Design a protein around this ligand. Structure first.
Ligand SMILES: N=C1CCCN1Cc1[nH]c(=O)[nH]c(=O)c1Cl
Ligand SMILES: N=C1CCCN1Cc1[nH]c(=O)[nH]c(=O)c1Cl
Lengths: 438, 438
């Protein structure tokens, strides 16, 4: 066995770590021996010197094996699927898609995570629901799949514990945007789920603003996935604007419910059907993308996705009365049942103009500031792309716990808003492009 | 004010940190805000992406200013000197030189450190002496300079606290061998000493095995030093073998006393006179190197260096009776008054041969293992360079607290010993070469 400083050095000098090296490190992360500073140091060493595919693969196997591998009754094998995102602002697609897919006859044991970087995390969003518990054991997860068809749980002592520790550390040390670290973090989770098919939404324009990097991530997820016996596909989607109208935790549960009522914004609905469709096709439950997309759409419209979501909530510890009130309530009734912020503040158009877009990144940065978790904090987009607005009309409603937005943070959000002199137009739908295993 | 993850990113991408950036980080190290993982991450980011001289300079000013700047009566100005080493195995030159120089009329407030990398630290060595306390306040240090002419103290809440925290973190994260981190760690300490002259022993063959890197370090210490108003010079010395006959904590106090009795091995004595000589010349208390070297030699021979060392010990909390017994005792009496190891084990020559050298690095690695602090653990070289030894004759005596050396650690020490078929010869003296401010 080598000590940590020796193995850090091996990577710091451009060297390739063996399998016992990788496992030694990971196992030290798990037991407490790798002190915080050594974890920060190795993460930065990997971030800057990289890993090649053999190494990423082993990293993935090692995080996967720090906890239990999950097992299901043979009868579920071909129905087990999942959808993971590499992250986008306002992306609440997972909240909708896990129950929608359960209502199409899939079983979905989603292991997901918390806020990472400036993208928000599904786990933090679900936690805005009083009594929703993300820590769920393997036995308990089998009961969740029985009752609801799906669940959304975090990493823990028994599931990928090492990815939870490395994940929390990356968040604060600028080692989030590492291809091998992302690949091993996503794939490790999905490997322990014992899936027949996985689709991963890779966004750009997002953790890798550049189209070139996103493609490399996509083929790395897919290639590394395929070598570990996982049928993976990736979608590349340009998200320079937030998905839908909401960014937050409670606000995004609210809008995901709107989507599950068969309403909500068209871009959120479009990506839910596109991505679930793709997944149904890949898993062999739909013959084509359009057939798949329509199966998922029908679940959003007939109330059945919503019904699976209510089962999921109650099964993960939400009081049953409260789950019913949430799924059956009106938009207004849902806003009173879920965290609100202490106060709300609207921001006003500076001049006449046509909304070209709201920029995702300035918005996420400011809300991470105000979010620093507070589950009612967030923002609400009051205008659409293509809309012509006049001077003075509200365009953002920020839900905040602290004081009136400062001069700075106000200017910073105001830069998010991009107006042209272009004639009004209808808001186009988001971009998608699949990537398969070669 | 920027948050830590932002400033880590700036350096991770090859970017140059401003002065407010550097100070922000350092001040966060000091207050607890920079978590262990962020410190590990920035250290590795600096280690791999480097800093240029403006940045190193500011880093140095910032670590220096995390605590108090030390002040002395105007009358001492031109007598204040110090000697720092970038590290070598068995290098106990500082223990001898601080009191020897005090006995030549200098005042020496040495701020030194602990084990870093695989080189041992002066502070750890002095601590083998019962009741020797390295934490000493600025007011207390003025009393030490009055009574003894010298002291040896560590970093603390009031002196370069930030270098103490970064120093401990580098030790475990393979960010020791960073030019800018070494420069700022050494220079920061020496800046707060308010010196008229400083000499820094740069070893190679040591933190930078390669001659090329050592030279770059030397001109960086000297150049960065000179721009901050410090008269610095560096000596380059090839230390591929241990200095003298001892490696440890208690063993090196013992040999430094032997040197102060005017005995001891010729290489230790040579480097003490060479380096102190240089320092006296640079500070203007000697006209030439040889005059300086002879002034220091005379202090080793007339018992006066020893007398200053006893004042220093008692003044830093060693019981006065115990200080007298140590300085006045015989070698044997000193070995009973200081930590011994639980057991001793000799290692035997495998075959006939002439000692070409004992290799420093294998020895340091093995003793860091067995040292993992235990202040009686160490090794003793029983043979000299040039000596012809027969099969079976003892060449190393390892003082250890644990069990009989394992098969491995035994082989690893045995590789340290390098025998030739060369006819016997007299052991040459170590290599030295000065470097001045340009
Ligand atoms: N979709 C989201 C929400 C926050 C982070 N993220 C992508 C992701 N997920 C991981 O599990 N691991 C990662 O490294 C990354 Cl990156
Ligand atoms: N002479 C010794 C004993 C252990 C470390 N060292 C050199 C040194 N000293 C510092 O103060 N800071 C460093 O970075 C370095 Cl490197």
């Amino acid at each position: 066995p080598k000590q940590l400083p020796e193995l850090i050095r091996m990577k710091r000098d451009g060297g390739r770590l063996s399998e016992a090296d990788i496992r030694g490190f990971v196992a030290a992360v798990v037991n407490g021996s790798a002190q915080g500073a050594q974890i920060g140091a190795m993460l930065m060493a990997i971030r800057l010197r990289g890993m090649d595919l053999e190494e990423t693969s082993v990293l993935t196997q090692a995080l996967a094996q720090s906890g239990q591998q999950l097992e299901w009754p043979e009868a579920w094998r071909q129905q087990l699927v999942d959808k993971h995102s590499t992250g986008g602002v306002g992306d609440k697609v997972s909240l909708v898609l896990a129950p929608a897919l359960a209502a199409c006859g899939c079983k979905v044991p989603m292991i997901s995570g918390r806020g990472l970087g400036h993208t928000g995390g599904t786990l933090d969003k679900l936690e805005s629901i009083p009594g929703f518990n993300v820590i769920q054991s393997p036995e308990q997860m089998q009961v969740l799949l029985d009752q609801a068809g799906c669940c959304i749980v975090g990493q823990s002592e028994q599931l990928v514990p090492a990815d939870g520790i490395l994940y929390a550390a990356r968040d604060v040390t600028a080692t989030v945007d590492s291809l091998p670290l992302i690949t091993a973090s996503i794939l490790s989770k999905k490997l322990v789920e014992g899936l027949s098919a996985l689709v991963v939404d890779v966004k750009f324009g997002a953790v890798f603003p550049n189209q070139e990097q996103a493609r490399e991530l996509a083929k790395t997820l897919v290639g590394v996935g395929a070598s570990l016996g996982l049928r993976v596909a990736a979608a590349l989607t340009a998200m320079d604007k937030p998905l839908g109208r909401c960014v937050g935790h409670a606000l995004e549960v609210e809008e995901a419910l709107l989507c599950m009522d068969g309403a909500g914004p068209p871009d959120l609905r479009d990506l839910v059907t596109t991505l679930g469709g793709a997944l149904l096709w890949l898993s062999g439950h739909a013959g084509t993308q359009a057939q798949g997309a329509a199966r998922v759409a029908a679940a959003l419209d007939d109330g059945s996705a919503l019904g699976r979501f209510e089962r999921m909530l109650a099964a993960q510890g939400v009081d049953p009365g409260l789950a019913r009130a949430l799924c059956s309530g009106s938009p207004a009734e849902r806003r009173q049942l879920l965290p609100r912020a202490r106060e709300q503040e609207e921001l006003l158009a500076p001049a006449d103009g046509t909304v070209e877009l709201v920029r995702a990144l300035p918005l996420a940065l400011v809300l991470h500031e105000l979010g620093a978790l507070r589950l009612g904090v967030g923002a609400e987009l009051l205008v659409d792309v293509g809309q012509r607005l006049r001077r003075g009309t509200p365009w953002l409603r920020v839900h905040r716990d602290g004081p009136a937005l400062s001069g700075p943070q106000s200017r910073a959000l105001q830069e998010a808003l991009v107006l042209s002199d272009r004639a009004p137009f209808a808001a186009p739908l988001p971009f998608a492009e699949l990537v398969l295993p070669p």
